[PDB]
From Swiss-Prot:
Upper classification of the organism: Eukaryota, Metazoa, Chordata, Craniata, Vertebrata
Superkingdom of origin: Eukaryota
Complex and partners: Identified in the spliceosome C complex. Identified in a IGF2BP1-dependent mRNP granule complex containing untranslated mRNAs. Interacts with SEPT6. Interacts with C9orf72. Interacts with KHDRBS1. Interacts with UBQLN2. Interacts with PPIA/CYPA. Interacts (via the RGG-box) with the HOXB-AS3 peptide; the interaction inhibits binding of HNRNPA1 to the intronic sequences flanking exon 9 of the PKM gene, preventing inclusion of exon 9 and promoting inclusion of exon 10 which suppresses formation of the PKM M2 isoform and promotes production of the M1 isoform. (Microbial infection) Interacts with HCV NS5B and with the 5'-UTR and 3'-UTR of HCV RNA.
Protein name: Heterogeneous nuclear ribonucleoprotein A1
Species name: Homo sapiens (Human)
Region (Globular B domain): 88-178
Mod. after translation: Sumoylated.
Length: 183
DNA sequence: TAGGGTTAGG
């Protein structure tokens, strides 16, 4: 079926008392769970305050994210699309942000090209195709802001994105300082 | 609130 990575959600901010079972009890309400686990320190067996749930289908994952906010064992938790272990090493991979950087877009790209691809992921708030202040020339990248951080997360976990007929690279937007800090 | 003994010899 769909890849395990795209069927899984990271659940952060779990109460100290949530266990594999109480977690499953909550999330099974949105579909069939193929995996459900609270992460624990190997040594002291104590909860690390986070876990994962994996559904049989991405559509169930989507259903669960459409049901936010989630309260598990009396605490509002923070479900997020699961970012792969390799991608988790990149700067800002786990940031909650509503904006993405879209790089490598053709000179004739227009806003409608960005909408036709990105509106299927969520409600768009702002689209900025960047130009050099001063020369007025296109720089080949844009920013797109959405109303929900999950739209960004669901887009960046996918590998390819076709805008104005060709692939473009999409990453979470890091600020000017964050880019420096990741240098 | 970022992963479960889950990542480079011919």
């Amino acid at each position: 079926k769909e890849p395990e990575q795209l069927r899984k959600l990271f659940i952060g901010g779990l109460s100290f008392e949530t266990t594999d079972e109480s977690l499953r009890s909550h999330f099974e309400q949105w579909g069939t769970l193929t995996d459900c686990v609270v992460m624990r320190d190997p040594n002291t067996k104590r909860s690390r305050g986070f876990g994962f749930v994996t559904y049989a289908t991405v559509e169930e994952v989507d259903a669960a994210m459409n049901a936010r906010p989630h309260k598990v064992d009396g605490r509002v938790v923070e479900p997020k699309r699961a970012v792969s272990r390799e991608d988790s090493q990149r700067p800002g991979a786990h940031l909650t942000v509503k904006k993405i950087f879209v790089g490598g877009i053709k000179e004739d790209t227009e806003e409608h090209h960005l909408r036709d691809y990105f509106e299927q992921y969520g409600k768009i708030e702002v689209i900025e195709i960047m130009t050099d202040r001063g020369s007025g020339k296109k720089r080949g990248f844009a920013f797109v802001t959405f109303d929900d951080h999950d739209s960004v997360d669901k887009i960046v976990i996918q590998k390819y994105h076709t805008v104005n007929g060709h692939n473009c690279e999409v990453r979470k937007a890091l600020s000017k300082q964050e880019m420096a800090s990741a240098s």
